[PDB]
Design a protein around this ligand. Structure first.
Ligand SMILES: [Cl-]
Ligand SMILES: [Cl-]
Ligand SMILES: [K+]
Ligand SMILES: [Mg+2]
Ligand SMILES: [Mg+2]
Ligand SMILES: [Mg+2]
Ligand SMILES: [Mg+2]
Ligand SMILES: [Mg+2]
Ligand SMILES: [Mg+2]
Ligand SMILES: [Mg+2]
Ligand SMILES: [Mg+2]
Ligand SMILES: [Mg+2]
Ligand SMILES: [Mg+2]
Ligand code: NA
Ligand code: NA
Ligand code: NA
Ligand code: NA
Ligand code: NA
Ligand code: NA
Ligand code: NA
Ligand code: NA
Ligand code: NA
Ligand code: NA
Ligand code: NA
Lengths: 56, 46, 119, 81, 194, 65
RNA sequence: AGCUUUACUGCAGGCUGUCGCUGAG
RNA sequence: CGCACGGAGGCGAAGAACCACAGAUUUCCGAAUGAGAAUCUCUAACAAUUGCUUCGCGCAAUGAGGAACCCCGAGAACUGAAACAUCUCAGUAUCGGGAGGAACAGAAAACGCAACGUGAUGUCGUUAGUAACCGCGAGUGAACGCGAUACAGCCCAAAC
């Protein structure tokens, strides 16, 4: 079975959904954790310095 | 799929947003909905 | 406990405390370990009381040996709040010293003797 | 504070229920239960509500189909407004 | 004349001798069974506490904290590292155990602020330090000419910023002259070389 | 407009509450007429009914009811 | 870059002595 | 009568529009705190951790955010050395914790132009690429003092 097109047909599982906290469609409904804001993992909002150039 | 009451409100809103710029606005501004979404060609969130 | 090397019979303790109360009303007394300590050091101490329910024990460990190298007699009290009440305080007291009794000089003297005898 | 009744849902299908089943259809607040929709209606139009059916519509609002007692006449109640 | 306090102090100069020695051999048995942070009604070393700011008053708290002895509990590298940085066993943290203890305590009491701390011994595998904390919101303290200073906003979380006594020492700020070139006014402003 | 601030303050707690339930009703019947696509509208009033209600509620708060 | 080994240099880990916890005859 | 110049209609001399300050209102989720949940739901709530305590959540605190700045911890590698291991990149990137409008520091167990001298602390200019480090290779690199800025000096523990 090809890992390409033929394996694309079974993709009907819902994971990332609209997040109650940040509004982004990143709330993983299986993990109950937002990949964008950290909701469900952290009380503090998810944020990293690598999201921008080092001197900025 | 089984939608919840909240999901339903959002889908509802998306359908409404998916309308056109009324004809009078065109006149009132002496003369485009950039948020037009097709059920097939486009994909909503959730 | 660690500073206690002998047990004082309930009855003896009663007499001792009794003398203390009359000591405050007839003579002089010092309330609090610091004031007690200075008595023993200055010599003005005739009889000193030490509670056995003190925590930390550090607060009083020194009393025993200090008294010995000063001749000053000392007795143990089980309760801490009892010695405080006797001395006339609304709070408890780790230790107290009878600085010159009063119409108890006889009793105290006997207690001092009863204890010495209690080894 | 939110009101229970928003407005009369007037449409062809809404009429049939009125002319043919003594039912009035309303757009009601979506936090309203069948029981609250019942009272509200009786207090605003002075009638006797027999049964209430609700539906959360794809318009984002809640629709209620309210049947009146044979005592009251839907058509007449709706006619005064 | 000597203060009674002086005796507590003089006893702790040698915690392995005399009565204190037996006291410790006893307490630690109960301690090893207590938790990470235990609030205690009275300081085990009164002289030391009062000396450090303690006061038998409302809003003044004390707690014994135990921390493990030894070097850093470090994980070996999982990617490329030059020999210099491949160590695990000999690496030690730059914050002393007494400072770790002050932090663990302050977290246990979110509303309080660390005033100071002192050692109360150690066994073969852990150290105990008693930390003195203050309630910056209690009027018994807001109205104290000696402690009200800790109430100011800029004293919030003072322990986590190394403003504590053990913090400032650990930061190499003791000396005012030679040797403190990279430490004062702050480690960070000196490029972290202290 | 047709209803001023003074007039609202010259009312009694019970008169405002009655005036309120009155406006609310006019509003409801305005919307109902609009729901039926009723053209006998007068846009400026359905807009006023909302402001008047806001005013009465505002004063009820000010006066302590 | 992956891999190997009696290539160079190190790092975990195991074994072992010693110090602390640790005391009485 | 917003951007927004339409149609209908309305508001304003009862002084509207508009601007400033103050106040009212301010749904749901959200640190999110009664409990659960992809913004909804289920049967009175400071959840959790603390301080005080009338030992009752009665009175209080913490939580999260913020452009960067600040403080305390954890801490690479590409690279340079024309290879490379110490060294270098660099206490940099990145990570953990936290404060404020600024932080931090701060009234000598100092300095040591050695003096019959200076006199809390930051910072700027200089001292100086000097002293010092270093397969003594490549590289790394202060301080005292001085000229300025601004200046400010105090409180406990103990004795009694
Ligand atoms: Cl703190
Ligand atoms: Cl000089
Ligand atoms: K390297
Ligand atoms: Mg693949
Ligand atoms: Mg449609
Ligand atoms: Mg249904
Ligand atoms: Mg290779
Ligand atoms: Mg909740
Ligand atoms: Mg190279
Ligand atoms: Mg600075
Ligand atoms: Mg070379
Ligand atoms: Mg360097
Ligand atoms: Mg120098
Ligand atoms: Na689609
Ligand atoms: Na509607
Ligand atoms: Na705290
Ligand atoms: Na250093
Ligand atoms: Na390879
Ligand atoms: Na508002
Ligand atoms: Na609270
Ligand atoms: Na309570
Ligand atoms: Na090269
Ligand atoms: Na190479
Ligand atoms: Na080198």
């Amino acid at each position: 079975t090809g890992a390409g097109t033929p394996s694309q047909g079974k993709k009907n599982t819902t994971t990332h959904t609209k997040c109650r906290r940040c509004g982004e469609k990143s709330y993983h409904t299986k993990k109950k954790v937002c990949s964008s804001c950290g909701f469900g993992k952290s009380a503090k909002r998810r944020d990293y310095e690598w999201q921008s150039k080092a001197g900025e | 799929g089984k939608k919840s009451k909240a999901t339903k409100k959002r889908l509802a809103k998306l359908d409404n947003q998916n309308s056109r710029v009324p004809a009078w606005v065109m006149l009132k501004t002496d003369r485009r909905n950039h948020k037009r979404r097709h059920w097939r060609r486009n994909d909503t969130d959730e | 406990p660690v500073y206690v090397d002998f047990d004082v019979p309930a009855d003896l303790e009663d007499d001792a405390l009794e003398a203390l109360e009359v000591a405050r009303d007839t003579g002089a007394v010092k309330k609090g370990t610091n004031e007690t300590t200075k008595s023993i050091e200055r010599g003005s101490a005739e009889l000193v009381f030490v509670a056995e329910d003190v925590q930390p024990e550090e607060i009083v460990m020194h009393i025993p040996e200090l008294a010995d190298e000063k001749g000053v007699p000392f007795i143990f009290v089980e309760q801490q709040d009892d010695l405080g009440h006797a001395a006339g305080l609304e709070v408890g007291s780790a230790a107290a010293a009878v600085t010159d009794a009063g119409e108890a000089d006889a009793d105290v003297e006997d207690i001092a003797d009863k204890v010495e005898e209690l080894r | 504070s939110w009101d229970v009744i928003k407005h009369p849902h007037v449409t062809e299908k809404a009429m049939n229920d009125m002319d043919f089943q003594n039912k009035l259809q309303f757009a009601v607040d979506d936090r309203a239960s069948k029981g609250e929709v019942a009272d509200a209606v009786e207090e605003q139009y002075d009638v006797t509500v027999e049964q209430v059916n609700t539906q959360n519509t794809m318009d984002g609002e809640k629709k209620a189909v309210v049947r009146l007692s044979e005592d009251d006449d839907a058509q007449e109640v709706a006619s005064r407004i | 004349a000597r203060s009674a306090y002086s005796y507590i102090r003089d006893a702790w100069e040698n915690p392995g001798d005399g009565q204190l020695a037996e006291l410790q051999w006893q307490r630690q048995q109960e301690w090893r069974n207590e938790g990470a942070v235990e609030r205690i009604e009275r300081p085990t070393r009164l002289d030391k506490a009062r000396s450090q700011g303690y006061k038998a008053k409302q809003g003044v708290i004390v707690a014994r904290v135990s921390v493990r002895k030894g070097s850093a509990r470090k994980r070996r590298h999982k990617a490329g590292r030059r020999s210099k940085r491949q160590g695990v066993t000999r690496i030690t943290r730059r914050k002393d155990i007494q400072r770790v203890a002050e932090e663990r305590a302050s977290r246990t009491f979110p509303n309080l602020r660390v005033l100071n701390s002192y050692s109360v011994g150690q066994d073969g595998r852990q150290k105990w330090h008693e930390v003195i904390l203050i309630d910056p919101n209690h009027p018994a303290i807001q109205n104290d000419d000696d402690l009200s200073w800790i109430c100011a906003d800029d004293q919030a979380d003072r322990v986590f910023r190394g403003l504590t006594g053990a913090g400032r020492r650990n930061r190499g700020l003791s000396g005012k002259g030679k040797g403190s070139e990279k430490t004062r006014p702050s480690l960070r402003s000196n490029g972290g070389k202290g | 407009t047709v209803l001023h601030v003074q007039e609202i303050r010259d009312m009694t707690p019970a008169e405002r509450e009655a005036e309120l339930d009155d406006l609310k009703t006019e509003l409801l019947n305005a919307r109902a007429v609009q729901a039926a696509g009723g053209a006998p509208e007068n846009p400026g009033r359905i807009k006023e009914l909302r402001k008047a209600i806001a005013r009465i509620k505002t004063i009820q708060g000010e006066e302590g009811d």
